[PDB]
Design a protein around this ligand. Sequence first.
Ligand SMILES: [Cu+]
Length: 76
Amino acid sequence: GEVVLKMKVEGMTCHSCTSTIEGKIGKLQGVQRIKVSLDNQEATIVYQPHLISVEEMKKQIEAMGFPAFVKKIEGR
Ligand SMILES: [Cu+]
């Protein structure tokens, strides 16, 4: 099975930033599911620990401008 990463995000309080990241991340060869929230300012990224990595996720996310605190590995 895949692995869930939970990253707290700041500032992302609209559907645009979140959707944009959802698309961009969705594009990457190795992600399986993604759940970027805004309300509770937190981003779920669900990827396969082989194809892509935390750093790809964050580096690509942070690169947009949105700082993110990737620190939960609650896979199932
Ligand atoms: Cu936004």
